[PDB]
Amino acid sequence: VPGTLLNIALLNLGSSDPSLRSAAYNLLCALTCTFNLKIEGQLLETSGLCIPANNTLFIVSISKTLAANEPHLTLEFLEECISGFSKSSIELKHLCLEYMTPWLSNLVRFCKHNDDAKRQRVTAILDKLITMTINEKQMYPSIQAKIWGSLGQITDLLDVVLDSFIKTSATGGLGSIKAEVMADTAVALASGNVKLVSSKVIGRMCKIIDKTCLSPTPTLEQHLMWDDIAILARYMLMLSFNNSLDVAAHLPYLFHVVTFLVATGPLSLRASTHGLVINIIHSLCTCSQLHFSEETKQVLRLSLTEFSLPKFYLLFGISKVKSAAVIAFYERETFALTSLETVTEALLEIMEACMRDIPTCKWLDQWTELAQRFAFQYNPSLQPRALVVFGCISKRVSHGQIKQIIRILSKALESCLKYNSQVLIEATVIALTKLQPLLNKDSPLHKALFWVAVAVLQLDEVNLYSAGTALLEQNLHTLDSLRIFNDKSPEEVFMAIRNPLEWHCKQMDHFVGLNFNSNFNFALVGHLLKGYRHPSPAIVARTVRILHTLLTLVNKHRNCDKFEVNTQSVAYLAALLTVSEEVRS
Amino acid sequence: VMMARRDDLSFCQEMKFRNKMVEYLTDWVMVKCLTRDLDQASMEAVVSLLAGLPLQPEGVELMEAKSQLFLKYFTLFMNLLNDCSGMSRRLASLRHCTVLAMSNLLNANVDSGLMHSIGLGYHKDLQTRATFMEVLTKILQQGVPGTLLNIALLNLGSSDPSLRSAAYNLLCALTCTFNLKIEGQLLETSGLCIPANNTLFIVSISKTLAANEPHLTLEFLEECISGFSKSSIELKHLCLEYMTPWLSNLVRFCKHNDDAKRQRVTAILDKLITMTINEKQMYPSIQAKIWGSLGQLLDVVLDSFIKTSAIKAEVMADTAVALASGNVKLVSSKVIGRMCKIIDKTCLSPTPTL
């Protein structure tokens, strides 16, 4: 009775009808006396009191004084407000939101208890306020500024608010106008207490990405939780411009989200994810809490420029668009891990630049842990992406981590006996590429990884061969940086590691029909020669660099000139014959 | 092609030549398919002709004649874009070219152009607005504050994403060019995909500016209120929120003794009244934001209400309720005081019947 009658009094005090205003005013007086409602600017019952039509500032004053004084009314009052609001005219709807504005504060009181009924009716009030927001497209900045800005102040409730937003978005997932407006509204939630709201949104995203691994599916877009991720990615774009206030706690977690999403799903989500990064880099150039140098700021400015280039559009699985923004507000490029590698090193150069200036951060270590967790754990959709990223970002590695990676490579090849497996193989090989410069100078593994690359090339899959040659290219740079060739042929070094393996290697070579024991240089060249077929001119040119490297190395242990033809160099020279003007002359 | 090669060619009177060429080709800017291709081609040529072109009619009158010639070309381009507002793509290409024509015309002719250009900033077409704001961006970092600040802020509101990014870059440019002191610092860049709901950000920028940059207030508020009349209901609402901080500054201008500044405050209050009368949906919300804040001048306010009343009169009565909530005692003291003084004034020149 107190709440229902108080709303009907207050709302009627608004009216264009004069008799209605007088009657309402007498009802307010009666409620005040009967329920002893403590009121400033005291209230007097009487007939014929000719109250003005514009009294909004009086109704509002009464309401918030009541909202402080008589808080139990709030549960009933806001429920009744939204019921009357939805029925009323647009003029009455402006008035209605103005009087609603103070009440929102009390909504936390009911929530502390965690018994269903109280928490449920606040949750229903939030869903009704959300519904109201979706419906009244011409009240839209008004609702968001006053209702959602006030709710944005209120920390405790934000988990209930976000689960209401997310469940509202869940009603149809990405492409549902319910979700679309909810994302745009989510910025209003953050605007009051940015750090907690964004921490809960990003936290839900991270936790839900982890939940994908709790029950795996082969492909991420298919996953049981795909809509939940897609919704949060939508929110993250909108928030990301406000993240110009936020980023300093978050930056790793946002790149963790980018890493999984970077070119996935329908093209609007890709555009969103490009925008997410652009906005984060811009936010890192201006957060008033940070103090980056002119060099670091210049690096970020040039990074914005770089991310704005068509190169980065192709990396994010955007093609055939002038502006990512326009589409942000399927023709999957079947995702090329080399694109994620490129993005990840660029985001790494952004983070590294910043981390020099902020010595008190843990950002790259947290990103390393987050990526590491997903790289090692079994989840077919995410694990490849994670491996690539972990490899790119890491600053140290252990033989136990390499064991896990090469075990993942092996298990992925077992799964090929039984597309996803291949992408996991490519990922592991890219990971090995980035990780092998990190490995200790006296580790056997540098030499071992040359054979991992050889085995990968043997597979005959276009992207696997590209990855194996990247691994091999980087491996030979690594071993030359370790001086290892200076007193030995590559043949002796790699064949020593084969000797224990030799029982296994014999079976490989006899099924391949290449035999390194009989002639090492020609077998290695046999593998490399397929690289000349490769559809991509970049992989051919890499293959040529590898042959040049090997040619130089074989002669390096003799102390010969690199073009001295001999029983070891000749294979490389014959391989190089269509591609090197230096060899030809 | 000739204009592309203009850097190679020789000219005795290049500026006059290009001026006369735009004058001629603009006559062509008006079988239907071919005439529309002629419009496209003519406009593409005009975009080439206008590229660093100072205007030259055939000294103080010359600057005013240059402004009048600017207004002719500019109006013709506006009409052509209104007419725009395979057949679809040709129209969009003509529109994009027309926008670039305005852009180049402005980029050279700044002293003649800027005032009319603000009229582009209001214009109903969001794509044209966004591009025009990038043109303003070129002028302002090369070498106005109130008019441009409103067109930035109001456009940050838009449903169009490209418009929001463009506006945000314009705000950044104005901030740098006019050294406008801002919290939560602002970074110029392409492709920044700003949300549609950013009202709390636009508002925060506005009131921080309203504290920091009071000299803008008259220039800004008048242009905002003009933009109110142009806008959708959503953009009208947003205008109120960001206007609200600025109102407070208006006292500084009537504390100032300049008759022109006192007049401009009075004209702002008249335009606030005009908006208050016209924009009925908003009207309870307008009263709450605008008239409450203004209630915190008040002779001038009441004379503006009374003179405008002299629905207008009813709205002024009903709005006076909001106005009174400010310092109740002073507002009511002035209303009642005017009543008493006017009743006394009846005796200063009597009539038989009241």
Swiss-Prot record, chain B:
UniProt signal peptide: none
Tissue: Detected in brain, peripheral nerve, lung, colon and muscle.
Superkingdom of the organism of origin: Eukaryota
PTM per Swiss-Prot/TrEMBL: Ubiquitinated by RNF7/RBX2, leading to its degradation.
Compartments where located: Nucleus; Nucleus, Nucleolus; Cell membrane
Disulfide-bonded cysteines: none
Effect caused by changing P245L: In a colorectal cancer sample; somatic mutation
Result of changing L140I: In a colorectal cancer sample; somatic mutation
Subunit structure: Interacts with HTR6. Interacts with SPRED2.
Free-text note on domains in this protein's UniProt record: Binds phospholipids via its C-terminal CRAL-TRIO domain. Binds primarily glycerophospholipids with monounsaturated C18:1 and/or C16:1 fatty acid moieties and a phosphatidylethanolamine or phosphatidylcholine headgroup. Has lesser affinity for lipids containing phosphatidylserine and phosphatidylinositol.
Disorder association: Neurofibromatosis 1: A disease characterized by patches of skin pigmentation (cafe-au-lait spots), Lisch nodules of the iris, tumors in the peripheral nervous system and fibromatous skin tumors. Individuals with the disorder have increased susceptibility to the development of benign and malignant tumors.
Physiological role: Stimulates the GTPase activity of Ras. NF1 shows greater affinity for Ras GAP, but lower specific activity. May be a regulator of Ras activity.
Entry protein name: Neurofibromin
Organism whose genome encodes this protein: Homo sapiens (Human)
Gene responsible for this protein: NF1
Complete-protein stretch covered: 1021 to 2069 of 2839
